[PDB]
Amino acid sequence: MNLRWTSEAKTKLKNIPFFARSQAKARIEQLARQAEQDIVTPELVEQARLEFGQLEHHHHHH
């Protein structure tokens, strides 16, 4: 069900907004499967956090 979260990854997950933490967790663990790893690094956690940052610049319109 869940993958192996590193201590650093756990901390990184905490740095993510609660509203999107479930969202991010789903992304992070899916990214781990993209690498076929059972253990998620804080780097994967950052990736999910970054992608949400890139796709959302607050004013999503012109």
CATH number of 3-54: 1.10.8.550
Name residues whose C-beta falls within 8 Å of residue 28's C-beta, 6 or more positions apart in sequence. 9, 13, 40, 44, 45, 47, 48
In the chain, where are the structural domains located? 3-54
Q: Gaps after which residues in the chain, C–N over 2.5 Å?
A: none
Distances (CA, A) of 61 to 1, 35, 49, 57: 37, 34, 21, 9
Q: How far apart are CA 57 and CA 42, in angstroms?
A: 23
In eight-state DSSP terms, residue 36 is T
Instruction: For residue 46, give the nearest of 23, 16, 7, 22 by alpha carbon.
Output: 16
Q: How was this structure determined?
A: NMR
Distances (CA, A) of 19 to 6, 24, 37: 22, 9, 26
Instruction: For residue 38, give the nearest of 12, 16, 17, 9 by alpha carbon.
Output: 9
Q: How far apart are CA 57 and CA 29, in angstroms?
A: 24
